[PDB]
Amino acid sequence: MDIDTYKEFGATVELLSFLPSDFFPSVRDLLDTASALYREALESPEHCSPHHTALRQAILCWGELMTLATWVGVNLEDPASRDLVVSYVNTNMGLKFRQLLWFHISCLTFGRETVIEYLVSFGVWIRTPPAYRPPNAPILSTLPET
Amino acid sequence: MDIDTYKEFGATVELLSFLPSDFFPSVRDLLDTASALYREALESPEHCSPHHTALRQAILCWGELMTLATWVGVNLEDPASRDLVVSYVNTNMGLKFRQLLWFHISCLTFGRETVIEYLVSFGVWIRTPPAYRPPNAPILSTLPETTVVRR
Amino acid sequence: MDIDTYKEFGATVELLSFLPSDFFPSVRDLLDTASALYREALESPEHCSPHHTALRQAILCWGELMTLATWVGVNLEDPASRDLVVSYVNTNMGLKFRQLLWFHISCLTFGRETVIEYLVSFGVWIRTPPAYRPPNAPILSTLPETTVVRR
Amino acid sequence: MDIDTYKEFGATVELLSFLPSDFFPSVRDLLDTASALYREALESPEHCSPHHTALRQAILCWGELMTLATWVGVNLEDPASRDLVVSYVNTNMGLKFRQLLWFHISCLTFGRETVIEYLVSFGVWIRTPPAYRPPNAPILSTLPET
Amino acid sequence: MDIDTYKEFGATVELLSFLPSDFFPSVRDLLDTASALYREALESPEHCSPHHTALRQAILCWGELMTLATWVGVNLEDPASRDLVVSYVNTNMGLKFRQLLWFHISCLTFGRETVIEYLVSFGVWIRTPPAYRPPNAPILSTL
Amino acid sequence: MDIDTYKEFGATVELLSFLPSDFFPSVRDLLDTASALYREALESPEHCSPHHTALRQAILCWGELMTLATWVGVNLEDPASRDLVVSYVNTNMGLKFRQLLWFHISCLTFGRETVIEYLVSFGVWIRTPPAYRPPNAPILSTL
Numbered sequence: 001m002d003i004d005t006y007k008e009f010g011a012t013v014e015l016l017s018f019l020p021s022d023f024f025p026s027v028r029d030l031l032d033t034a035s036a037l038y039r040e041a042l043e044s045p046e047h048c049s050p051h052h053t054a055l056r057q058a059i060l061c062w063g064e065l066m067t068l069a070t071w072v073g074v075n076l077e078d079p080a081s082r083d084l085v086v087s088y089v090n091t092n093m094g095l096k097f098r099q100l101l102w103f104h105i106s107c108l109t110f111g112r113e114t115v116i117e118y119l120v121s122f123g124v125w126i127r128t129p130p131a132y133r134p135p136n137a138p139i140l141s142t143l144p145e146t
Numbered sequence: 147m148d149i150d151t152y153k154e155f156g157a158t159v160e161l162l163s164f165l166p167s168d169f170f171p172s173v174r175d176l177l178d179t180a181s182a183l184y185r186e187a188l189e190s191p192e193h194c195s196p197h198h199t200a201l202r203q204a205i206l207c208w209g210e211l212m213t214l215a216t217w218v219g220v221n222l223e224d225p226a227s228r229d230l231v232v233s234y235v236n237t238n239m240g241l242k243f244r245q246l247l248w249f250h251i252s253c254l255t256f257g258r259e260t261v262i263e264y265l266v267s268f269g270v271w272i273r274t275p276p277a278y279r280p281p282n283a284p285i286l287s288t289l290p291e292t293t294v295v296r297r
Numbered sequence: 298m299d300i301d302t303y304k305e306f307g308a309t310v311e312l313l314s315f316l317p318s319d320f321f322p323s324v325r326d327l328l329d330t331a332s333a334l335y336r337e338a339l340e341s342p343e344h345c346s347p348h349h350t351a352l353r354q355a356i357l358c359w360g361e362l363m364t365l366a367t368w369v370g371v372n373l374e375d376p377a378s379r380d381l382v383v384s385y386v387n388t389n390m391g392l393k394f395r396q397l398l399w400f401h402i403s404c405l406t407f408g409r410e411t412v413i414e415y416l417v418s419f420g421v422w423i424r425t426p427p428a429y430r431p432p433n434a435p436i437l438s439t440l441p442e443t444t445v446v447r448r
Numbered sequence: 449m450d451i452d453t454y455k456e457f458g459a460t461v462e463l464l465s466f467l468p469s470d471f472f473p474s475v476r477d478l479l480d481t482a483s484a485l486y487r488e489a490l491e492s493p494e495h496c497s498p499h500h501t502a503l504r505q506a507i508l509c510w511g512e513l514m515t516l517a518t519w520v521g522v523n524l525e526d527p528a529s530r531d532l533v534v535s536y537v538n539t540n541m542g543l544k545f546r547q548l549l550w551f552h553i554s555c556l557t558f559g560r561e562t563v564i565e566y567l568v569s570f571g572v573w574i575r576t577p578p579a580y581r582p583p584n585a586p587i588l589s590t591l592p593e594t
Numbered sequence: 595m596d597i598d599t600y601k602e603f604g605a606t607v608e609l610l611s612f613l614p615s616d617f618f619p620s621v622r623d624l625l626d627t628a629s630a631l632y633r634e635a636l637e638s639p640e641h642c643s644p645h646h647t648a649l650r651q652a653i654l655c656w657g658e659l660m661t662l663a664t665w666v667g668v669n670l671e672d673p674a675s676r677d678l679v680v681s682y683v684n685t686n687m688g689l690k691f692r693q694l695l696w697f698h699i700s701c702l703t704f705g706r707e708t709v710i711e712y713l714v715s716f717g718v719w720i721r722t723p724p725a726y727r728p729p730n731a732p733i734l735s736t737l
Numbered sequence: 738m739d740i741d742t743y744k745e746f747g748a749t750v751e752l753l754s755f756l757p758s759d760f761f762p763s764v765r766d767l768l769d770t771a772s773a774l775y776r777e778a779l780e781s782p783e784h785c786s787p788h789h790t791a792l793r794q795a796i797l798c799w800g801e802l803m804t805l806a807t808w809v810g811v812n813l814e815d816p817a818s819r820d821l822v823v824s825y826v827n828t829n830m831g832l833k834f835r836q837l838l839w840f841h842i843s844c845l846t847f848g849r850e851t852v853i854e855y856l857v858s859f860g861v862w863i864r865t866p867p868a869y870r871p872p873n874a875p876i877l878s879t880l
Contacts, residue, residue, distance in 0.1 A: 057203035081227040171424040296439035326575035333466040354651035619864040630751040730871040736854040
């Protein structure tokens with residue numbers, strides 16, 4: 001149907017592919033971040049945000065993929081095919097899901113405009129030659145200056 | 147976690163368990179209904195409603211599962227394992243997706259209070275033993291079964 | 298060019314894909330209905346409505362197809378290919394033209410809002426398994442359900 | 449001269465052929481209906497309606513056709529030709545005359561707009577497939593609801 | 595019914611009989627012009643104008659005819675009859691469809707009054723005897 | 738990206754497909770026209786108009802291509818390959834560059850609406866069958 005996950009949130013698959021693929025944290029670290037910070041809001045009977053709705057849907061979708069991986073491991077006898085399917089599920093779809101989780105958790109934490117401008121700035125930084133860019137990689141943080 | 151995707155809107159997996167498993171239409175029929183009724187809103191850059199957000203997410207996850215099915219059919223050599231994975235993806239993972247799609251498309255078309263009242267009434271109807279069960283099962287509709295609108 | 302006939306009219310080619318093939322009268326019955334209800338408006342030199350315009354174009358296309366069918370029957374010596382082409386023209390393209398004629402006549406008769414709500418409710422009905430839906434399909438008519446014309 | 453019987457009454461030969469040919473009651477039943485309901489108005493020295501005028505003319509015309517049929521039966525010796533002529537008079541012209549009588553009697557009884565909309569509704573009903581139309585055939589009646 | 599599709603647009607089959615049969619561009623050229631000029635309005639979900647409605651109908655009708663032609667080419671084993679019917683669908687019906695496409699695209703581009711005056715003037719030009727007929731046939735132009 | 742340089746100027750590649758490939762003047766004639774008419778504005782330090790900006794860009798891009806051609810002619814010892822690539826740079830890319838130069842010089846000279854109407858009318862003229870096509874092809878003129 002040609003639907004974009006982010007264009008309702010002001011981003012784009014191309015804008016989130018403008019960052020390196022290995023920049024995004026692991027799916028486990030991102031799920032831990034969500035459960036630590038917004039569990040009581042992701043389990044509440046309220047919307048509270050488009051970010052909360054999208055994050056609920058993404059978490060449940062990843063849970064279904066993980067149950068699929070467990071079912072494959074249990075019900076496929078061929079080791080090569082089982083391993084190929086599990087590796088596909090963990091890598092190919094895992095990358096898209098950690099892009100999604102990073103985007104939504106980071107929005108909820110730091111602000112959507114802040115996250116988008118950080119995407120742009122980091123994408124330009126990773127492409128600027130080293131001798132002519134600030135030496136420290138950009139980073140998001142809520143810790144104020146002292 | 148224990149998100150329970152429907153309780154954000156006002157139902158539960160237990161309230162949607164009133165409907166049998168084979169009550170829900172095919173995933174193709176539900177995608178056709180979505181693309182026929184709410185395509186221009188599911189493609190827009192606006193937050194239309196929580197149902198639109200959840201529907202975009204669900205359609206994209208189903209697309210991801212279908213790309214996975216295409217990939218396994220292309221790249222797995224073992225035919226038994228290939229068919230097992232594809233059948234699982236198509237049936238067991240598809241059942242939950244057509245439940246979710248039915249709930250969201252119906253809640254968009256007819257309304258949330260109406261869908262919840264319909265779920266309760268269909269629970270009553272399917273609970274009644276078959277001997278005392280009327281033939282007219284409850285149904286969602288915006289027009290009466292006979293629409294005598296002369297002009 | 299990816300044109301949708303009904304999108305201009307607020308419907309969609311896949312909204313009307315739920316109506317079964319036996320839901321529509323024959324092309325002859327639909328043309329008789331058109332010529333008996335709106336002939337003095339379809340043959341007038343005025344733009345009456347987009348439904349009138351589309352219905353004139355549909356009637357002219359069906360006329361071209363009928364001349365094609367008779368030409369095939371007359372100039373094709375091979376009985377097998379002759380009847381194959383004639384049957385294709387009469388069934389396959391006949392179904393699309395029955396659908397088009399029905400949509401436009403029903404719009405002109407009942408109102409576009411009414412016919413689109415009816416299409417939605419009939420889709421809801423036809424998507425339900427036979428065990429969970431009322432046995433009487435939703436009906437669109439100008440008559441009361443008792444079909445008695447008083448006054 | 450290209451004259452239409454009904455177009456002064458708001459109908460058309462094509463609109464009355466939009467109904468099945470066997471739907472219209474017999475000529476005898478229609479003449480009985482006329483003589484029972486509007487005899488004192490069809491014999492009065494007043495117009496009282498275009499429907500009364502057209503019905504008077506139609507009744508007299510059918511009477512002339514029937515006298516023709518009697519004359520043929522009496523003055524034709526050939527049985528095959530006599531039977532062919534009488535059958536023609538009774539069927540081919542009988543159908544047109546019972547269409548005419550039905551239209552005018554039904555107008556006088558139920559209203560002209562009611563009769564025309566009934567023609568349209570019945571023509572659409574007889575063509576709609578059975579599973580998607582109301583099960584009872586439409587009918588005209590002056591009996592109010594209780 | 596004798597509906598005469600152009601009667602609502604102010605023409606007739608008698609008025610479009612002024613132009614010869616081989617005057618109209620090919621269906622490919624006409625569909626190219628339509629896609630180049632009015633694609634975004636022919637895909638729009640709006641009654642733009644009766645010409646847009648009739649043009650959508652004509653384009654989808656020609657698409658149905660081309661689907662017929664492909665189906666015949668695949669499912670007719672008899673080569674002679676197959677080629678006969680495909681040639682018919684391409685020429686005999688294509689003529690009427692390029693008449694319709696020419697009329698509606700030209701109306702949309704230049705104006706209905708302009709197209710009708712062009713029809714009258716082309717009738718004059720084609721009626722003039724060859725010795726007194728200017729070599730520049732009439733043409734529709736916005737320039 | 739499918740940027741389609743003419744979309745901002747109100748044309749498309751579909752609209753400029755009406756004109757045949759061999760209709761456009763040579764790159765030499767187009768650069769001569771540009772230098773004769775708008776040299777003092779193409780050397781000016783001002784945003785005169787989007788056509789001036791695009792024309793400066795196109796002229797410098799063709800200059801870079803000609804520098805490539807000279808460098809190849811000097812530094813490619815292989816005569817066959819050298820002639821192949823120089824002929825490519827002259828014809829295959831020169832075609833697109835004379836399309837671009839024609840469009841922008843004609844827009845600057847005659848008006849954007851005038852150029853678009855000329856494109857439509859030339860489409861009509863080239864679609865007309867040869868028997869009913871006037872011998873005077875459409876032309877852009879201020880006279």
